Amino acid sequence: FSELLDLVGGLGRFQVLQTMALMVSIMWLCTQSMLENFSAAVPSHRCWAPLLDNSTAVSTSLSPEALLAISIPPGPNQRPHQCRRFRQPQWQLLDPNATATSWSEADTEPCVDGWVYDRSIFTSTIVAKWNLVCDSHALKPMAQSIYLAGILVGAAACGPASDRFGRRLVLTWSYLQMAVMGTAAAFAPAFPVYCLFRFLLAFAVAGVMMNTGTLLMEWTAARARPLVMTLNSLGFSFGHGLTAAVAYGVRDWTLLQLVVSVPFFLCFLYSWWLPESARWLIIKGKPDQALQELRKVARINGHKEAKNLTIEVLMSSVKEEVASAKEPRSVLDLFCVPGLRFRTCISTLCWFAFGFTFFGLALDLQALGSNIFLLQMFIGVVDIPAKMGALLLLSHLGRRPTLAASLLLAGLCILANTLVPHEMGALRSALAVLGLGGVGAAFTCITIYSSELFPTVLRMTAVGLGQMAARGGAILGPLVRLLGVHGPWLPLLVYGTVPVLSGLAALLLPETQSLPLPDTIQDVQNQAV
Numbered sequence: 001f002s003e004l005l006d007l008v009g010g011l012g013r014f015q016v017l018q019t020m021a022l023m024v025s026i027m028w029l030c031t032q033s034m035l036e037n038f039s040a041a042v043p044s045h046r047c048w049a050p051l052l053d054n055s056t057a058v059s060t061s062l063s064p065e066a067l068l069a070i071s072i073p074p075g076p077n078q079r080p081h082q083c084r085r086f087r088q089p090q091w092q093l094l095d096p097n098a099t100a101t102s103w104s105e106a107d108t109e110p111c112v113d114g115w116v117y118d119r120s121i122f123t124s125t126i127v128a129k130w131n132l133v134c135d136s137h138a139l140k141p142m143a144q145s146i147y148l149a150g151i152l153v154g155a156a157a158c159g160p161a162s163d164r165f166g167r168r169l170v171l172t173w174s175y176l177q178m179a180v181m182g183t184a185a186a187f188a189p190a191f192p193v194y195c196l197f198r199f200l201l202a203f204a205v206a207g208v209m210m211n212t213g214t215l216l217m218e219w220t221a222a223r224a225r226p227l228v229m230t231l232n233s234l235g236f237s238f239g240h241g242l243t244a245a246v247a248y249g250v251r252d253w254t255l256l257q258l259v260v261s262v263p264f265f266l267c268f269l270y271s272w273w274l275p276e277s278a279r280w281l282i283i284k285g286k287p288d289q290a291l292q293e294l295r296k297v298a299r300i301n302g303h304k305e306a307k308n309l310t311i312e313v314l315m316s317s318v319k320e321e322v323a324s325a326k327e328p329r330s331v332l333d334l335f336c337v338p339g340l341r342f343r344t345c346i347s348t349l350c351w352f353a354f355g356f357t358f359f360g361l362a363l364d365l366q367a368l369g370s371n372i373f374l375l376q377m378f379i380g381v382v383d384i385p386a387k388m389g390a391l392l393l394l395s396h397l398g399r400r401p402t403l404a405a406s407l408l409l410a411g412l413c414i415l416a417n418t419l420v421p422h423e424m425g426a427l428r429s430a431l432a433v434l435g436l437g438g439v440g441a442a443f444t445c446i447t448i449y450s451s452e453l454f455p456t457v458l459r460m461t462a463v464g465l466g467q468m469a470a471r472g473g474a475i476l477g478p479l480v481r482l483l484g485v486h487g488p489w490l491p492l493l494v495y496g497t498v499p500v501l502s503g504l505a506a507l508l509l510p511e512t513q514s515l516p517l518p519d520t521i522q523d524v525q526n527q528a529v
C-alpha cells in the first residue's frame with residue numbers, strides 16, 4: 001500500500017492538519033472522562049438544623065462555633081458529624097466544662113430534614129444535588145463504575161462495527177453521540193437518568209478513542225507513524241491541564257458538563273472533511289472508493305500529479321493483497337488462528353495492566369498537595385515528558401524492550417513504595433511521580449505496538465478487546481483497595497505485581513520495528529514464517 005502514500009504524500013499538509021484536529025478532540029474527550037473529579041466533588045456537609053438554618057431565629061451572644069456545637073454532635077472525623085444531629089438542642093453542652101458522656105447517641109437523630117453543603121469551592125455538584133452522602137455515599141463511585149462499564153461495552157460493540165463499516169463513519173457518529181449524551185447528562189432530572197446518559201456517553205467515548213488513533217496510523221508514512229501516534233497520546237496529557245483550567249473557571253456542574261460537551265458538535269461537523277481509510281477500503285474490496293479518498297488526500301497535499309492514479313494503477317498495485325480477503329472474519333478468529341492467539345493473549349494482558357494500575361496512580365498523586373486543580377494539572381505535567389521519553393526510546397530501541405521497561409518501571413515503583421516509611425516523604429513523592437511516568441509511557445507503547453501486531457482486517461477488533469480489558473481492570477481497581485483490612489501493604493503488592501508480571505510477559509511478544517503493517521491474517525502467519 002505504501003507506494004500509494006508515497007504518490008499521495010505520507011507526511012504533509014493533510015497529515016499535519018489531521019493530527020492537529022484529532023488531537024484536540026482527544027483533549028476534550030479527556031475532559032469528559034476526568035470530569036467526575038469536579039462534577040461529583042463531595043463538599044463538606046452537615047444536617048439542616050433549626051438553630052443554624054432558620055433565618056428568622058432570635059439573636060444571642062453566642063458565637064457560630066458555639067451555636068453549631070449546640071446542635072451538631074462531634075464525629076469520628078475529629079469534626080462536626082456529617083450524618084447526625086441532636087434530637088433537642090443541647091443547652092447543657094455550652095459549658096466548656098461539659099463532657100461527651102453527657103449525651104446518649106439515642107439523643108441524636110439522622111438528617112431527616114436534609115443536608116447543608118459547603119459552597120466555598122463549588123457552587124453545586126451531583127453529590128449536593130441528589131444527596132449522594134451518608135448511607136447513600138456508595139452512589140458516587142457507582143457513577144464512575146457505570147461510566148467505565150459504558151466504555152467497556154462501547155469498545156466491545158464499536159470494535160467489530162469499526163472493522164465492518166469503516167473507521168471514519170463510526171468516528172463521526174461517535175462524535176455526535178458524545179455531544180448529544182453529554183448535553184443530555186447536563187440537564188438530567190434524576191440520578192438514574194444521569195447514569196443512563198453517562199453510560200451512553202461512554203459508549204461513544206470508546207468509539208472515538210479507538211478510531212482516532214487507528215485512522216491516524218493508517219494514513220501516515222512509516223517514519224512518521226510513531227510521532228503521530230505520540231501526539232495523539234499527548235492529547236490526553238493536555239486534556240488534564242484543560243480539565244484543570246476549565247473546572248477552575250466554571251463551578252456549576254451543569255454548566256461545566258454542558259461546556260465540555262458543546263465542542264463535540266464542532267468535532268462532528270469537521271469530521272466530514274476527513275477521508276475514509278483508503279487502506280481499509282482497498283482491503284474490503286472497494287478500490288473504486290479508495291481511489292476517491294486517495295485523490296482527495298492528494299488534492300489536500302497539493303499534488304497536481306494525482307492523474308497518475310487510476311483504478312488501473314491502484315488495482316495493479318493491490319490485487320494480490322485483495323485476493324486474500326474473500327472470506328469473512330470475526331473476533332473468534334483472533335482465538336482460533338495459530339499465530340493471532342498468542343499476540344492476543346499477551347496484548348490483552350498488557351492493556352489490562354495499564355488500565356488496572358493507571359487510575360490508582362492518578363489518585364496516589366493527589367497526596368502531593370492541597371489544591372485540587374493544581375493536582376489535576378500535575379497529572380498532565382508529569383505525563384508530557386514521560387511520553388516524549390517514550391517516543392525517544394521507542395524510536396531508538398524498538399517497541400518490545402520499550403514496553404517491557406516502561407511497565408517494569410511502573411510496577412517496581414509501586415512495589416518500592418511498600419518499603420519506604422512516611423518519614424521519607426520526599427522519596428515516596430518521587431516514586432509516585434516515576435510510577436505515573438511509567439504507566440503513561442506504557443500507554444504510548446501499547447497504543448503503537450498493539451496496532452502494528454494485528455492485521456488491517458481485524459485491527460480494530462483487537463484494539464477493542466484491549467480497551468475492554470483496560471476498562472475491566474479500571475473497574476477492578478477500586479475493589480482491590482478493600483484488601484487493606486488484612487494489611488496496608490497488600491493492595492500495593494497486588495497493584496504492583498500485575499504491571500511487573502505483564503511487563504515481563506511483554507518480552508515474549510514479537511518485535512515489529514522496520515516491518516510493514518500487516519493487512520491480512522495470511523500476513524500474520526507469513527511473518528512467523
Ligand SMILES: O=c1[nH]c(=O)c2[nH]c(=O)[nH]c2[nH]1
Nearest residue numbers: 030033233236237383440443
Ligand atoms: O495518558 C492517559 N491519561 C488518561 O487519563 C487516560 N484515560 C484513558 O482512557 N487513556 C489515558 N491515557
